Amino acid sequence: DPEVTLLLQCPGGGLPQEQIQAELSPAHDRRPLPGGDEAITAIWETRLKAQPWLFDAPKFRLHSATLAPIGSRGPQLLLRLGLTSYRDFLGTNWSSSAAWLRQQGATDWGDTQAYLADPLGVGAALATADDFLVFLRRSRQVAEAPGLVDVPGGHPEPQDLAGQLVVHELFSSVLQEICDEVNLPLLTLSQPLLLGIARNETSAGRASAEFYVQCSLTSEQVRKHYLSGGPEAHESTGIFFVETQNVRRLPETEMWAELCPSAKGAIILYNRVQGSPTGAALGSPALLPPL
Numbered sequence: 001d002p003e004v005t006l007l008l009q010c011p012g013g014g015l016p017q018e019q020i021q022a023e024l025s026p027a028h029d030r031r032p033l034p035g036g037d038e039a040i041t042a043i044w045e046t047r048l049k050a051q052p053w054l055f056d057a058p059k060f061r062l063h064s065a066t067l068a069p070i071g072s073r074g075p076q077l078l079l080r081l082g083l084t085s086y087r088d089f090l091g092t093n094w095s096s097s098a099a100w101l102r103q104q105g106a107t108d109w110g111d112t113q114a115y116l117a118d119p120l121g122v123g124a125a126l127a128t129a130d131d132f133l134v135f136l137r138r139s140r141q142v143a144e145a146p147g148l149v150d151v152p153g154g155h156p157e158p159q160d161l162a163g164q165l166v167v168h169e170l171f172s173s174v175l176q177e178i179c180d181e182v183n184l185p186l187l188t189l190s191q192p193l194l195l196g197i198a199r200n201e202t203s204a205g206r207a208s209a210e211f212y213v214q215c216s217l218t219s220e221q222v223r224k225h226y227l228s229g230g231p232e233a234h235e236s237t238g239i240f241f242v243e244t245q246n247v248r249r250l251p252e253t254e255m256w257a258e259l260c261p262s263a264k265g266a267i268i269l270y271n272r273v274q275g276s277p278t279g280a281a282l283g284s285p286a287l288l289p290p291l
C-alpha cells in the first residue's frame with residue numbers, strides 16, 4: 001500500500017485525551033518557499049477568478065509526534081503543531097510541483113515536508129452496538145479520490161497551557177464531524193481514543209489523526225439517522241457497514257482498491273491497535289481463526 005504510511009501507532013489499545021500534550025509553536029510552521037510565497041498567492045488568485053465563492057480557513061499543521069517509553073506514567077504523546085491554511089494547502093500539497101517541493105525540502109532542511117502546508121486531518125473507525133464499522137461513499141465531483149469509499153472525518157479549524165485546549169479541539173472535532181455527516185446524536189458517542197497518525201502519499205504526505213469511536217445505536221438505527229437528514233444533510237452519497245469480523249481481512253477484498261488513502265490508514269490502525277489480541281482468551285484459535 002504505497003499511498004499510505006504509518007507515522008504513529010498508539011499503545012494500550014489507543015490513547016484518551018488526558019494522556020496527550022500539544023506544543024503549538026511558530027517553530028512548527030511551513031518554511032517560506034525558496035522563490036517566495038508569491039507562487040502560493042498566484043495559484044490562489046487564479047482559483048478565485050474561476051470560483052470567487054471559495055474562502056480560506058486556518059488549519060493545524062502536523063510537524064511531528066513523539067511517543068513516551070511504553071508502560072510509563074504521565075503523558076504518553078507529544079504532538080508538535082503549527083498553523084497553516086486551505087490556501088497554503090492548494091499552493092503546496094495540491095500543486096503539480098509538490099514532488100519538487102519535497103526534494104527541495106530534503107536538500108535545504110533535511111525534511112521532505114519543510115515546504116508543505118501539511119494540514120492535520122481527523123478520521124474515525126466508528127463501531128455500532130451490533131459490531132459493524134461505518135463507511136461513506138464520496139461524490140464523483142470532489143478534487144481528490146472522487147467516488148472512493150471514506151470514513152467519517154474532516155480538517156479542524158483553530159479557535160501545555162494553550163496545548164490542552166488544542167488537544168480538546170482535536171477530540172471534539174472528530175465527534176462534531178460524526179454528528180454533522182452521519183446525523184447521530186452526540187450522546188450516542190463514546191469519548192474518542194487516538195489509534196495513531198497516517199500519511200497520504202498521494203497528497204504529498206499530509207497526515208490524519210485516526211480515532212476509535214463507539215456508538216450505542218445499531219447499524220440499522222445509524223442508517224435511519226443518516227438517511228433521515230435527506231440529500232442536503234451530508235456531503236457523501238451513501239452509507240454502508242462491514243462486520244468488525246470481516247474488517248480483519250479487508251486488505252484482501254475488492255473493497256480495498258476503492259478506499260481513499262486516509263480511510264485505509266483508519267482501517268490499518270483499527271486492525272493493529274483495537275484488533276490483534278495479545279492475551280490467551282481472545283488469542284485462542286476458535287476466537288482468532290488462523291489465516
Ligand SMILES: O=C(NCCc1ccc(F)cc1)c1ccco1
Pocket residue numbers: 059085086089090094119143144155
Ligand atoms: O477542497 C479540497 N479538499 C477538501 C478537504 C480539505 C483538504 C485540505 C484542507 F486544508 C482542507 C480541506 C480540495 C481541493 C483540492 C484538493 O482538495
